[PDB]
């Protein structure tokens, strides 16, 4: 479900861009339990190669939120490596 509102688009002031998707919102808020559940649940697949209106996947949207802060960088690196390892086993064919 695409959250395409003005609060969610990337611009200056009163915005929070995360990738307009529930998996991207779960990755850009450091959950990894909602992430591992949305990725692996019998009801809904919540694939890793979904894009939003800017064409950004969840890896793009983790790059987009990345500040060069000490804690933001650790968050982004953790979620980047975790989703890479999980895409190695959910959709092992695609890069």
Residue 79 contacts a second copy per CB under 8 A: no
Residue 70 Cβ vs a second copy, minimum distance, rounded to whole Å: 9
Per CB under 8 A, the list member of 4, 49, 53, 69 interacting with a second copy is 69
Cβ distance 52 to 19 under 8 Å? yes
Q: Which is nearer to a second copy, 11 or 89 (CB)?
A: 11
Q: Which is nearer to a second copy, 28 or 46 (CB)?
A: 28
* Whole-number Å distance between alpha carbons of 65 and 74: 12
Residue 51 contacts a second copy per CB under 8 A: no
Q: Can you give the binding site for a second copy, defined by CB under 8 A? A: 6-7, 13-16, 18, 25, 28-30, 67, 69, 71-72, 75
């Amino acid at each position: 479900l695409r959250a395409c509102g003005r609060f969610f688009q990337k611009h200056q002031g009163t915005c929070f861009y995360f990738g307009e998707l529930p998996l991207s919102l779960a990755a850009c808020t450091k959950q990894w339990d909602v992430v591992t559940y949305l990725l692996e649940n019998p009801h809904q697949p919540a694939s890793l190669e979904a894009t939003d209106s800017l064409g950004n996947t969840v890896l793009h949207a983790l790059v987009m939120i990345a500040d060069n802060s000490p804690e933001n960088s650790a968050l982004v690196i953790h979620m980047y490596d975790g989703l890479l390892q999980m895409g190695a086993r959910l959709c092992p064919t695609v890069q």
